[PDB]
Subunit: 220 residues, 3 copies
């Protein structure tokens, strides 16, 4: 028989907050990875080159690395199969040095300088839908409510409630600016769970103004 | 079934292999998937109810009518090309949240956001390059060529060459010669006529192909 | 298991591993393939006759000459980057059909539509990002950088940075400094001189590298 896979069907999603173990990843409530078509868990397949994962754990716990770029994911995010977070910044390749090659001191002597540069944290905000096989490059911030298209290659920050495909192409904003601004103040992802339950009929609709009134009367 | 590929020299005839009732594929169309290992139904056609991991739930008769994958004759589908089915998979960009709240977690106010996209329709004599992704509901007209790694979200006119993010590079022939191919439809000819005309098909001589049609096919 | 990557800290020296007669790769170039598992010749180089699935077929001689994959020195090839060989794979966009009719199925009128694209040539000091796809016939010049997930179908000039659908983002350096690097070619220096200049190579001081060349290397 063959080696098991992480998912038994594409009907299944994995709650990330209950699963993730890398101290360098932070994932908020309800966010899930539906990874059936790429076989492996979120931490072994989707999050790449993050020190402290399974293949680098023993090396990370030696404590000789210093701080690295972290991956922070908000609440209520939908991460589709094969979506990829590229960590570890430039992975030691300096486009501004004469060579991008990572000469080893073992082969090229003591003149070698380390070209690793942090890119900063990768941040995914709340209520973000990341389509299948999108690739998120180091250091980007994807604002709340954004949609990343399948196969998108995201190298720039994504404004809240933007829809972005391909080579950072913003194809629309989900709502008008005034209503976007409204969702960013009331922040329904931060409400107590019973208030989200109570307003579920409004969240499964386009009536932002109804949502804003529920906030005024009940949440505040 | 899970008949593998021994090398990239071999393709898999699709009409003889596919079992999903929601997939239609015509004669001679194949999948050359050596570099992605698994079968066309397992690896290339994604999120289609009735496939291997969801055959049980589909046979239970719960969902009704889903979008189908329709593929014509004489198509060439390269390793890792993917057809994305199941519409918006329940995410509604026009609702406040895209999150698919479960009833068992968020109560009865949950509304099902699923929306079909319509069938995915691929015509005849279409060439789909390696690791292209075909998004839900797209129609790809006869004779079109999809570049490797293309991400196709709009309909593709017959005999056009499309790459990248729906970038139409060109059309394969002049408009009048396209129209001639779309009338004569060599992919529907009796096999003897395709064989007899094979020396013309392996050329650019469309009007000589039309001469053959007028005189022998009718 | 020995050819497996144990972690993404691990890279495979290509000149010591590659066996396909139709691949040439220079000193020190490597493949960091942990996230796509298989070796460089199994996963990155595609449709090249003489690889493992087609060795016995290529042993016969049925085919003659095919496009080769040529990679220079000091190239960094990230996981899942792909080199597409075998040219048009017998699909002729200028013929009425792109379908590769087999003679067993359609008879003796079948004509072979295969056309070579030319060798795929990667220069020296090239960095190819993860899951980029290099299409047949492409020349990638010295010092170039190919972004992650780029799809390269046109030639890449020296020291250019290319992403997406052949998008030229920038050149790494001013034109004059690129010219200086294309003259002095540090990748061809005796190893003693590469070591001695390591402190310069690990910086942006091209004119200092030129000073080293003039005073110690220049033929
Ligand atoms: C596997 C995906 C995520 C599952 C998950 O883990 N949800 C957590 C929600 S919660 O924190 O417990 O509220 C879910 C999300 C949406 C699901 C899809 C949507 O529900 C729409 C249809 C519904 C059909 O019954 C099955 C196919 C399907 C296309 C679903 C397939 C699959 O189960 C999906 C894609
Ligand atoms: C695996 C591909 C499809 C195989 C298939 O199933 N054909 C069905 C035709 S038919 O209904 O029986 O008429 C075939 C089609 C074209 C083939 C390529 C072309 O024939 C061109 C060359 C020819 C060389 O002999 C092998 C490499 C190669 C580059 C071939 C590799 C591979 O065998 C290809 C790519
Ligand atoms: C696996 C990669 C290549 C290994 C290799 O084959 N080197 C050969 C050079 S030489 O002929 O022996 O001179 C190396 C090159 C750059 C390395 C990265 C850079 O060195 C930057 C940091 C350094 C940290 O110690 C580990 C993570 C890391 C992000 C490294 C991970 C990994 O080991 C990388 C990516
Ligand atoms: Cl999903
Ligand atoms: Cl093919
Ligand atoms: Cl690397």
């Amino acid at each position: 028989s063959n080696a098991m896979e992480a998912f038994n069907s594409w009907l299944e999603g994995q709650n990330l907050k209950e699963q993730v173990k890398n101290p360098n990843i932070e994932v908020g409530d309800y966010s899930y990875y539906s990874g059936f078509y790429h076989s492996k868990t979120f931490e072994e397949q989707a999050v790449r080159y993050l020190l402290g994962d399974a293949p680098t754990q023993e090396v990370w716990e030696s404590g000789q690395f210093g701080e690295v770029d972290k991956l922070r994911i908000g609440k209520f995010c939908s991460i589709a199969s094969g979506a990829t977070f590229m960590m570890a910044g430039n992975q030691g390749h300096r486009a501004d040095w004469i060579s991008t090659f990572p000469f080893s001191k073992k082969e090229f002597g003591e003149g070698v300088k380390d070209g690793f540069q942090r890119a900063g944290d990768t941040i995914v905000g709340n209520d973000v839908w990341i389509g299948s096989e999108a690739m998120i490059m180091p250091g980007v911030h994807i604002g709340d409510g954004a949609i990343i298209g399948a196969r998108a290659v995201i190298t720039k920050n994504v404004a809240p409630y933007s829809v972005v495909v391909g080579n950072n192409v913003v194809v629309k904003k989900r709502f008008d600016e005034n209503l976007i601004q409204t969702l960013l103040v009331i922040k329904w992802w931060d409400w107590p769970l019973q208030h989200i339950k109570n307003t579920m009929e409004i969240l499964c609709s386009g009536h932002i103004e109804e949502l804003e009134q529920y906030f005024i009367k009940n949440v505040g």
